[PDB]
UniProtKB/Swiss-Prot annotation, chain A:
GO molecular function: protein homodimerization activity
Protein name: 26S proteasome non-ATPase regulatory subunit 7
Protein family according to the UniProt entry: Belongs to the peptidase M67A family.
Biological role stated in the UniProt entry: Component of the 26S proteasome, a multiprotein complex involved in the ATP-dependent degradation of ubiquitinated proteins. This complex plays a key role in the maintenance of protein homeostasis by removing misfolded or damaged proteins, which could impair cellular functions, and by removing proteins whose functions are no longer required. Therefore, the proteasome participates in numerous cellular processes, including cell cycle progression, apoptosis, or DNA damage repair.
This protein's UniProt keywords: Acetylation, Isopeptide bond, Proteasome, Ubl conjugation
Miscellaneous comment: Does not bind a metal ion.
Claim: Protein biosynthesis is one of the keywords in the record: no
Domain MPN: residue ranges: 9-142
Gene Ontology annotations of biological process type: proteasome-mediated ubiquitin-dependent protein catabolic process
UniProtKB/Swiss-Prot annotation, chain B:
Additional remark text: Does not bind a metal ion.
Subunit organization: Component of the 19S proteasome regulatory particle complex. The 26S proteasome consists of a 20S core particle (CP) and two 19S regulatory subunits (RP). The regulatory particle is made of a lid composed of 9 subunits including PSMD7, a base containing 6 ATPases and few additional components. Within the complex, PSMD7 interacts with subunit PSMD4 through their respective MPN domain. Interacts with TRIM5.
Keywords recorded for this protein, A-Z: Acetylation, Isopeptide bond, Proteasome, Ubl conjugation
Domain of life where this protein originates: Eukaryota
Full protein segment contained here: 2 to 167 of 324
Species: Homo sapiens
Family: Belongs to the peptidase M67A family.
GO cellular component: cytosol; extracellular exosome; extracellular region; ficolin-1-rich granule lumen; membrane; nucleoplasm; nucleus; proteasome complex
Gene Ontology biological-process annotations: proteasome-mediated ubiquitin-dependent protein catabolic process
Protein name (record): 26S proteasome non-ATPase regulatory subunit 7
Entry function: Component of the 26S proteasome, a multiprotein complex involved in the ATP-dependent degradation of ubiquitinated proteins. This complex plays a key role in the maintenance of protein homeostasis by removing misfolded or damaged proteins, which could impair cellular functions, and by removing proteins whose functions are no longer required. Therefore, the proteasome participates in numerous cellular processes, including cell cycle progression, apoptosis, or DNA damage repair.
Span of domain MPN: 8-140
Coiled coil: none
Alphabetized GO MF terms: protein homodimerization activity
């Protein structure tokens, strides 16, 4: 009875640790704002598996966030680089450090859909003193509007604390 | 201190980056060791290894003086890194050993192009197996070999 492409997202520690670092790592240079990135992983019985991830340069106007830019040439290259090394991981969605959805995530997601028709947004909460750290979403099409529904997301890679 | 570095702090990311990258390409009959670049910061002779990317690398299993590491890739990939991550620098390289290889001295020499005090870190990928073993090439005709540098893991938070 599944009208939805994905119904669960398993975000691996790497990713969460990837993003958290990437966030704080660029904070020592007065990083004020949220980070945006791409997710790479595999697909199963509607379980999306998010194995790996890279950051992409992204800007948005803090006064009208319909003014934003995400560098698709970068993402395409960087993903190209990834294929040269890591076996078949695919662009499976994207991420950003929220902590909440943004007015423009729907539009950002639309760009991403170019690379994965069932892109899944995962909002990775970067704050340490902060419920479950990932919150996956996926754009549903409800004139004909568009909005993000919640998809179950938990963390869980095999082997070693 | 006649030595550039005397300690290497390898962060969980790296260790987890590499281990994954290793096993992640194992599901496709990965037979061999992985080689890569380390990115990080420098202090009071403590090298801090914050981040790392894999580079395509091949070596002949019958004469490992026949090997190749793709420097165009590393330069590019690093280029991409600067575009995002703040000042991390190429600080050495890594490979999944588990032991030193005949050619690491040569591979290191290529790397020295990008970091005159490159530090090799052998990241042991096996679970039933300290997981990092940093080295640095010392120049002892005038030979060249790797000395051990203290390496531990330790990033702040969760």
């Amino acid at each position: 009875m599944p009208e939805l492409a994905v119904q669960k997202v398993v975000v691996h520690p790497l990713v969460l640790l990837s993003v958290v670092d990437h966030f704080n790592r660029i904070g020592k240079v007065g990083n004020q704002k949220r980070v945006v990135g791409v997710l790479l992983g595999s697909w199963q019985k509607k379980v999306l598996d998010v194995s790996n991830s890279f950051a992409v340069p992204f800007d948005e106007d803090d006064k009208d966030d319909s003014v934003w830019f995400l560098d698709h040439d970068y993402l395409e290259n960087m993903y190209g680089m990834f294929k040269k090394v890591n076996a078949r991981e695919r662009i499976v969605g994207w991420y950003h450090t929220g902590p909440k959805l943004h007015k423009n995530d729907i539009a950002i997601n639309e760009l991403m859909k170019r690379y994965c028709p069932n892109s899944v947004l995962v909002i990775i909460d970067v704050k340490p003193k902060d419920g479950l750290p990932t919150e996956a979403y996926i754009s549903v099409e409800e004139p004909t509007s568009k909005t993000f529904e919640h998809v179950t997301s938990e963390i869980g890679a095999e082997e070693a604390e």
